[PDB]
Design a protein around this ligand. Structure first.
Ligand SMILES: [Au+]
Ligand SMILES: [Au+]
Ligand SMILES: [Au+]
Ligand SMILES: [Au+]
Ligand SMILES: [Au+]
Ligand SMILES: [Au+]
Ligand SMILES: [Au+]
Ligand SMILES: [Au+]
Lengths: 176, 176
């Protein structure tokens, strides 16, 4: 599968050199595929990057499905090989605000994850596991917010110590 | 005060063009000061950037002092003119992990803020406002984590709606 070779390779060139530093030539080196093979499949570097971001959204969506966003974060605690790639995701923050087409592409590529959270939370509410003194959307934004904070600290090299107890506290904050 | 002119100007060139895009020539344009005047004061672009980051640490430290990290975040909700600069801070995440000298410089430049949090939390514990079923350091990491999540969502252009209720919930999670 040539698409999946390109994506596994790209995730590494990106992880090691960052967004700007993943040149087309370096992306050939990491993938064993030509400029033409790469752009044929994905059009441009930005769409390649978004496809990877979609892969994270699809895997996180499965995890969320099973056991919510606390579980994604628990898993993030176990996957230190993923922190360089998380760095890259944070680098494009500026573009996510200066560029409406990219921003819309980013949001669309994240939609599978966004839907899974809504479904997971809805089923939790349906089963009476979530606290009902706080609106569910506030719980949602709360957990989104902790997630983004987790990605950021891990990305920036902060220690993982006490984050596990932070997670126990996040759970307790939103459950009955 | 030529140092403070350079810093006010730099904060804007950075906010508008991002880290890479704030060239030396553009930083002259934003500041009205020469390459030589800029490097005389700060040595290099990285130290200039760190000085700005220290300015945030010093202002946040004051706010934290008064009313803790929830208050910094409440203020962040009121300061949408600051979100482009927050973007820039997130761009260097990758360097914060690939570069130990920068990482140490970053941490040292943040130390005034880190100390203020410890002092604020210690005085809260001393006055019996914090919950005592959870270790205080876990509360600390929790609040650090929410903060970084707040910076990240605002930076990336997410909406500020329900973050205010998120803050009420964060407060309630850590107080008695
Ligand atoms: Au690379
Ligand atoms: Au959940
Ligand atoms: Au996971
Ligand atoms: Au990720
Ligand atoms: Au600029
Ligand atoms: Au506090
Ligand atoms: Au503030
Ligand atoms: Au800031």
């Amino acid at each position: 599968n040539s698409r999946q070779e390109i994506l596994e390779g790209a995730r590494r060139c990106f992880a090691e050199h960052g967004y700007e530093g993943a040149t087309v030539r370096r992306l050939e080196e990491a993938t064993g595929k030509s400029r033409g093979a790469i752009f044929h499949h994905f059009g441009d570097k930005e769409n390649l990057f978004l496809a990877l971001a979609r892969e994270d959204a699809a895997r996180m969506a499965e995890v969320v499905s099973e056991n919510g966003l606390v579980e994604v974060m628990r898993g993030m605690l176990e996957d230190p090989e993923r922190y360089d790639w998380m760095s890259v995701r944070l680098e494009i923050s500026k573009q996510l605000r200066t560029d409406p087409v990219f921003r819309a592409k980013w949001i669309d590529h994240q939609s599978v994850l966004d839907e899974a959270v809504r479904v997971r939370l809805s089923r939790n509410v349906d089963k009476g596991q979530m606290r009902t003194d706080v609106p569910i959307e506030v719980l949602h934004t709360f957990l989104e917010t902790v997630l983004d904070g987790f990605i950021s600290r891990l990305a920036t090299g902060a220690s993982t110590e006490g984050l596990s107890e932070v997670l126990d506290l996040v759970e307790g904050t939103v459950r009955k």
